[PDB]
Design a protein around this nucleic acid. Structure first.
Ligand code: 0G6
Ligand code: NAG
Ligand code: K
Ligand code: NA
Lengths: 34, 259
DNA sequence: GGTTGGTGTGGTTGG
C-alpha cells in the first residue's frame, strides 16, 4: 500500500506552505517558458 | 554534486540518505515518496561487477538530514528496511538500464518540516516538463570533484548540496557517450558553449532529479541520479533513470499489498 | 559526550 502523504506531496513545509520561494526555484520556472 | 551550493534547510525534505550499518558509511542518496516508501537507484544495492549485493539488514535510511555527518538529533529519522525491491529487468551488465529500486520501511515515518514526500509524475507532468532546455534540480551529499585522481578542494561537503540543470536533447545525450543509452534514461547538464556548470557525481546515485510544476506548484521527481563519465566534464552529461517511463512497475509494487 | 560538533546547553533538537 502507498501509505500516507500522496495528496500533500511536493509541497514543502518551509517553502510553498508558507508562501516562500527558495533561492533558485525561479530559475527552473524561467527555463519552462517557450 | 559538483558546482552546486549548500541547500537551504527544508529545501529537499524528500531527500534520503542510504546508510551502510557496518562499517558506517554514507552509500547513496534516495528519495521519500510516502510515509513508508523510498526510491533509489538499483546500482546502490546491487552491482555485481564491483561485488556489491546489499541486503535489507545491511542498510539504514536517514530521513530529514542536512549535515552529511553529524547525527541531527530529534530531526532526522533513522529507519530499517522491511524489504528491497529491485526492478526485475535492471541491466547491471550493460548500461544500468532501469537503474531503479523501491525500499519499504519497517515502520512508517512521521512527517515534519524536514520530512515530506515528493510527488511521482503522471503523463501530463512528464509530457509538459520533460523537454530539452527545461531545468531540473539535483541534490546530494556526493562528491564535489572527481576524487579518483588528484584535484584541489574538499572531496565531500559538510552539508547537502543542490544544483539546477537543463535536460538535454536525446541525440546529444546519445552522441556524448559510447555506453548504449535507453528510453529509460535521460541526460541533463549544460553544454560547453553555455558557460554554466554542474553535475551529479559519485555518491549522488539514488538522489532525485526534481522539477516544480507551474500548474499546481508541487515538486515532482522525474529522474534518479544513475550514472555518468567523470563529473562535470565538457561534452559529457549526467544520466538519470526516467521515473515516469518505469511508473507502471512502481505502482505495481507499491499498490500490491493492502497492509 | 552521546543512533554527533561546538559560537554549545540552543540549534534544523532533549538532556
Ligand atoms: C552509484 C552512483 O553513485 C553513481 C552516480 C554517478 C553519476 N555521475 C555523473 N557524472 N552524473 N553511478 C556510478 O558510479 C555508476 C555505477 C557503475 C559505474 N557508474 C558510472 O556512472 C560509470 N562512471 C559509467 C558506467 C559504467 C558501467 C555501466 C554504466 C555506466
Ligand atoms: C545477492 O545475494 C543474495 C543472497 O545474499 C543472493 O541470493 C542473490 O542471488 C544475490 N544476487 C546476485 C549476486 O545476483
Ligand atoms: K548537544
Ligand atoms: Na558536462
Amino acid at each position: 500500500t502507498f501509505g500516507s502523504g500522496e495528496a500533500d506531496c511536493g509541497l514543502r513545509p518551509l517553502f510553498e506552505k508558507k508562501s516562500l520561494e527558495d533561492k533558485t526555484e525561479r530559475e527552473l520556472l524561467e527555463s519552462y517558458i517557450d | 554534486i559538483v558546482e552546486g551550493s549548500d541547500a537551504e534547510i527544508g529545501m529537499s525534505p524528500w531527500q534520503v540518505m542510504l546508510f551502510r550499518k557496518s562499517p558506517q558509511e554514507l552509500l547513496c542518496g534516495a528519495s521519500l515518496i510516502s510515509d513508508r516508501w523510498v526510491l533509489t537507484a538499483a546500482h546502490c544495492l546491487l552491482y555485481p561487477p564491483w561485488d556489491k549485493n546489499f541486503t535489507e539488514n545491511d542498510l539504514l535510511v536517514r530521513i530529514g538530514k542536512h549535515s552529511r555527518t553529524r547525527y541531527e538529533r530529534n530531526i532526522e529519522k533513522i529507519s530499517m528496511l522491511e524489504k528491497i525491491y529491485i526492478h526485475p529487468r535492471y541491466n547491471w551488465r550493460e548500461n544500468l538500464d532501469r537503474d531503479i529500486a523501491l525500499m519499504k520501511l519497517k515502520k512508517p515515518v512521521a512527517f515534519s518540516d524536514y520530512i515530506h514526500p515528493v510527488c511521482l509524475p503522471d503523463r501530463e507532468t512528464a509530457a509538459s516538463l520533460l523537454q530539452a532546455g527545461y531545468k531540473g534540480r539535483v541534490t546530494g551529499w556526493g562528491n564535489l570533484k572527481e576524487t579518483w585522481t588528484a584535484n584541489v578542494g574538499k572531496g565531500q561537503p559538510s552539508v547537502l548540496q543542490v544544483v539546477n540543470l537543463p535536460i538535454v536533447e536525446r541525440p546529444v545525450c546519445k552522441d556524448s557517450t559510447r555506453i548504449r543509452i535507453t528510453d529509460n534514461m535521460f541526460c541533463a547538464g549544460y553544454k560547453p558553449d553555455e558557460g554554466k556548470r554542474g553535475d551529479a557525481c559519485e555518491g549522488d546515485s539514488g538522489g532525485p532529479f526534481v522539477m516544480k510544476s507551474p500548474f499546481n506548484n508541487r515538486w515532482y521527481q522525474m529522474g534518479i541520479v544513475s550514472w555518468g563519465e567523470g563529473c562535470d566534464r565538457d561534452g559529457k552529461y549526467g544520466f538519470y533513470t526516467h521515473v515516469f517511463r518505469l511508473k507502471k512497475w512502481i505502482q505495481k509494487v507499491i499498490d500490491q499489498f493492502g497492509e
